[PDB]
């Protein structure tokens, strides 16, 4: 038997109720099977050929979404605004009249019936910023023992010992900036921090599946730029509002901004229409604010700190600053030890040299390759620099070494070892493989330099005292 | 015979099903022929004037598409935003409850029914650029063996031996750069790798051409630049999301950027526009960030190695920087062999001396022509490069040679042969025709160089130590 549905409107003493069906309200009687007292406002009811209510179910589960604006004085009516900014007055459903009805919340509404059936939390911030937790830990970072201590303190200590902090009335810092040459470990540190925070939150609370990582908000540089005029500012305000709401005294909220060069550009000085004069003040006002934001730390990573606006870098707003530099000989040794694990297969000859001592052979290889990389020889002369007066200064590859190129060297050495295995059949990795990898990497990377003056060039010019005026490669 | 249609909504234990039909929701009984157990939410069903469900069908295939906004906690519903910023909560049908319906996906939906089914974006237009797979393979490229070996090791080798890479804990390279003088054969390799990938996908997964072509993306250069602020970055994000979705740790996705200098710069070289200042950080975050592309390889080709941003030209992003050098005598011989095929018609005059042995005659002709063009005679003198030091250097036409020039010479010789056979009636390519074509080409490309050219003279100037101040054409 085909029977239509409708939505209840009100209950009367005459055992007759108003039902909205077919786009109109009709006064219909209820069948003796159903109880008029059991009915609830906004509950969906069943109809039939005689338009008699026979069976009553639950409230509506689908429809439009409209943000709640204001509850009226009587409490049975609520004024809301639609998607196209239409103001409408609706009657709340029985469950709406634990969960708290507050202004600004979203409600599931139907325009034809004019009722709000449930409150649906939008939680738009949970979208576009959540990501799968990386597995990088603090033990996987080498050559950085001072910077990691700084960031680990600034992230954990205010939350490790809260009583001692309150004893000295020391507020946790709310601005952490990481800057340095490309491929030196900034994103690595950010990933390690995110992993540690996710593990800590999973330890403290449940819901390990989801929300455990919700406390780390990863935002790419231009990801917040939008085509419309005011959408980006509203997105900034909404993200900061959610960060304020989600934050607690014991649970930090880390909003990480990657590629700080794009946003936070110096106001003005833009030849194209990349108008930062609207977005940047919004970020400044959100971070500093008329009221101090609490339990929030913002982390920014960039390799061009010169183009960043002076106001965002002002102390107190981004006070904690960390510089990551080019690895030295000891840092290079540490990084190689991080990558050249003992579990990596080694050739029989190398093991026989040290009578099968894995650690001794590995450390000998690391020391030899590090000494070869940083040795000042004629073949390692990378660039020649002429200053205004200066002298013929020679920059070697040790002045441009980084963790990324060390990883690339190890990767191509492993590739050469695999090629040797496929062509010869002897598994293992040789020191000569490492040396060939080093020379090939330098030969491939000796085409980098261009007539530009980044921060390293500025540092060199300041050290010498004369501006850089000529740079040439030593091909022959 | 007259029968209606409707959309299934939910099922009950009373052998009843909710059906949306004619703009109203009803509950109906299924015919004994159809079993309600196999029914799924959102399936299209057939009705009748007696209002009885008689047969199930496939889901709806057309309608409005609405970007997905968020996934609700229950999992049976999701919030989606319409074209004009209207937001609705809609059920998720059986096919969506394969790849997770991640937020940011325009889902095919019916607003009146309130159900979702599918999605897609504009980045597929890149796949439309490669509608025809080039037929050129590695066998058609000559003079480059080390470069082809490297490009095969970067792409084909990691997927040819997964177990060996897993044992050595080595991941496939994240990016490959190809750089060299114009016409040296970068696009040839760029299209040969695409042809090989198409062949592999056709032979391994399925014979369908569209899926095989779907694993290669052709950027074409400045195609990403758009009119509105923040839309090009969204396009890049969509492209990389599409790339990450197709990856399965055994199927590579190759995104080829042509003319890398068009959209990538040093963030300060932009004079008229600085769109790259926002574009570059987005791509840097996409390539390496908190979440990194596991199995995506980015291949870039450019003619200006130094003009690219240093961050892109970093190990871990562009691991191998293959350099393609101008052909030498052996490379010229290889290219001529690849072009002067044995099957070309040859005049009986040429075959008279070599008893009609086509292969030997063609090889001798190729050697003679390459010897003619690679001759240090006063007739081949082209330019006089001077320096501040005063070490004047005489350059020949052989220095400014490439595969494109060889192809042009062969085409000109063929045109001369066709003109000769049209006028006289004796077919066959002659040796003197090649020499005439060579001298005519060297005459036609004579008055090319401008006052100052940083194309390939910067390397020579750096080699000599001094800068070029005057160059003159030494003809007659």
């Amino acid at each position: 038997p085909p029977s239509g549905y409708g939505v209840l409107l009100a209950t009367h003493d005459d055992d007759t109720v108003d039902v909205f069906t077919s786009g109109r309200k009709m006064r219909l009687t209820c069948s003796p099977n159903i109880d008029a007292a059991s009915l609830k406002k906004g509950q969906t009811v069943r109809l039939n050929e005689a338009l008699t209510v026979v069976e009553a179910g639950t409230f509506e589960a689908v429809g439009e979404i409209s943000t709640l604006r204001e509850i009226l004085a009587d409490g049975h009516r609520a004024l809301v605004v639609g998607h196209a900014d239409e103001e409408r007055v609706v009657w709340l459903a029985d469950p709406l009249i634990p969960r708290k009805l507050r202004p600004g919340d979203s409600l599931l509404v139907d325009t034809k019936a004019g009722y709000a059936f449930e409150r649906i939390p939008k939680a738009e911030v949970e979208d576009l910023v959540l990501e799968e937790v990386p597995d990088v830990s603090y033990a996987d970072i080498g050559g950085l023992s001072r910077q990691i201590e700084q960031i680990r303190d600034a992230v954990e200590l205010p939350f490790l010992h809260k009583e001692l902090y309150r004893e000295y009335s020391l507020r946790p810092p709310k601005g952490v900036l990481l800057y340095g040459p490309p491929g030196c470990g900034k994103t690595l540190i950010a990933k390690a921090v995110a992993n540690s925070l996710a593990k800590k939150m999973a330890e403290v609370r449940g819901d390990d599946a989801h929300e455990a990582k919700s406390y780390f908000l990863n935002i790419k540089g231009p990801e917040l730029l939008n085509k419309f005029v005011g959408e980006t500012e509203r997105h900034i305000r909404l993200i900061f509002q959610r960060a304020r709401e989600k934050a607690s005294e014991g649970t930090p909220v880390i909003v990480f901004f990657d590629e700080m060069d794009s946003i936070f550009r110096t106001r003005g000085t833009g030849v194209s229409s990349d108008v930062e004069t609207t977005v940047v003040p919004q970020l400044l006002s959100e971070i500093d604010g008329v009221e101090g934001l609490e339990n929030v730390i913002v982390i920014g990573a960039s390799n061009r700190e010169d183009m960043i606006d002076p106001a965002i870098l002002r102390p107190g707003r981004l006070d904690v600053k960390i510089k990551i530099e080019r690895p030295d000989a000891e840092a290079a040794q540490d990084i190689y030890s991080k990558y050249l694990t003992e579990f990596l297969p080694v050739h029989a000859d190398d093991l026989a040299e040290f009578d099968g001592d894995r650690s001794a052979c590995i450390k000998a290889m690391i020391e030899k390759v590090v000494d070869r990389m940083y040795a000042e020889i004629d073949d390692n002369r990378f660039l020649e620099v002429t200053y205004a007066n200066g002298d013929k200064e020679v920059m070697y590859f040790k002045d441009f070494n980084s963790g990324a190129m060390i990883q690339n060297v190890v990767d191509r050495a492993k590739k050469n070892a695999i090629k040797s295995v496929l062509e010869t059949g002897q598994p293992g990795l040789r020191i000569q493989h490492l040396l060939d990898s080093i020379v090939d990497e330098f030969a491939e990377n000796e085409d980098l330099p261009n007539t530009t003056n980044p921060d390293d060039w500025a540092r060199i010019s300041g050290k010498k005292g004369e501006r850089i005026v000529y740079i040439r490669t030593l091909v022959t | 015979p007259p029968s209606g249609y409707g959309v299934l909504l939910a099922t009950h234990d009373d052998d009843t099903v909710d059906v949306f039909t004619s703009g109203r929701k009803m509950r109906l009984t299924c015919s004994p022929n159809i079993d309600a157990a196999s029914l799924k939410k959102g399936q299209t069903v057939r009705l009748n004037e007696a209002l009885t469900v008689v047969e199930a069908g496939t889901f709806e295939a057309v309608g409005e598409i609405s970007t997905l906004r968020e996934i609700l906690a229950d999992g049976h519903r999701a919030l989606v935003v319409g074209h004009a910023d209207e937001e609705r909560v809609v059920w998720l049908a059986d096919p969506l409850i394969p790849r997770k319906l991640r937020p940011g996906d325009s889902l095919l939906v019916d607003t009146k029914a309130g159900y979702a089914f599918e999605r897609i974006p504009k980045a597929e237009v890149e796949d439309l650029v490669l509608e025809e797979v080039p037929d050129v393979s590695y066998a058609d490229i000559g003079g480059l063996s080390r470069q082809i070996e490297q490009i095969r090791d970067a792409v084909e080798l990691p997927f040819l031996h997964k177990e060996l890479y897993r044992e050595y804990s080595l991941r496939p390279p994240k990016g490959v750069l190809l750089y060299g003088p114009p016409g040296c054969g970068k696009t040839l390799i760029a299209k040969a790798v695409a042809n090989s990938l198409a062949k592999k996908m056709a032979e391994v997964r399925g014979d369908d051409a569209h899926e095989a072509k779907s694993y290669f993306l052709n950027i074409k250069g400045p195609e990403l630049l758009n009119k509105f602020v923040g839309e090009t970055e969204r396009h890049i994000r969509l492209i990389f999301q599409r790339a990450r979705e197709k990856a399965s740790e055994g199927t590579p996705v190759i995104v080829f950027f042509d003319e890398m200098d068009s959209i990538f710069r040093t963030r300060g070289t932009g004079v008229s526009s600085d769109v790259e200042t926002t574009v570059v950080p987005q791509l840097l975050s996409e390539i390496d960030g908190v979440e990194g592309l596991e199995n995506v390889i980015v291949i870039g080709a450019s003619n200006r190695e130094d003009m690219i941003d240093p961050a892109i030209l970093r190990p871990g992003r562009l691991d191998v920087k293959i350099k393609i050098e101008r052909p030498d005598a052996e490379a010229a011989q290889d290219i001529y062999s690849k072009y002067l095929t044995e099957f070309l018609p040859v005049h009986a005059d040429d075959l008279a001396e070599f008893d009609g042995d086509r292969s030997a005659c063609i090889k001798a002709m190729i050697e003679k022509v390459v010897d003619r063009m690679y001759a240090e005679i006063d007739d081949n003198r082209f330019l006089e490069v001077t320096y501040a030091n005063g070490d004047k250097e005489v350059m020949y036409f052989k220095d400014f040679n490439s595969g494109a020039m060889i192809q042009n010479v062969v085409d000109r010789a063929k045109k001369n042969a066709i003109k000769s056979v049209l006028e006289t009636g004796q077919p066959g390519l002659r040796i003197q025709h090649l020499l005439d074509s060579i001298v005519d080409e060297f005459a036609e490309n004579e008055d090319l160089p401008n006052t100052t050219n940083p194309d390939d003279w910067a390397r020579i100037s750096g080699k000599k130590g001094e800068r070029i101040v005057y160059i003159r054409t030494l003809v007659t």
Binding site: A84, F228, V275 | V229
Partner: peptide
């Protein structure tokens, strides 16, 4: 006075039916 390109920002429009 170098010539420079531009990038515009759309404003939403209200349309019914």
């Amino acid at each position: 006075g170098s010539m420079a390109q531009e990038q515009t920002k759309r404003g939403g429009g209200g349309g019914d039916d």
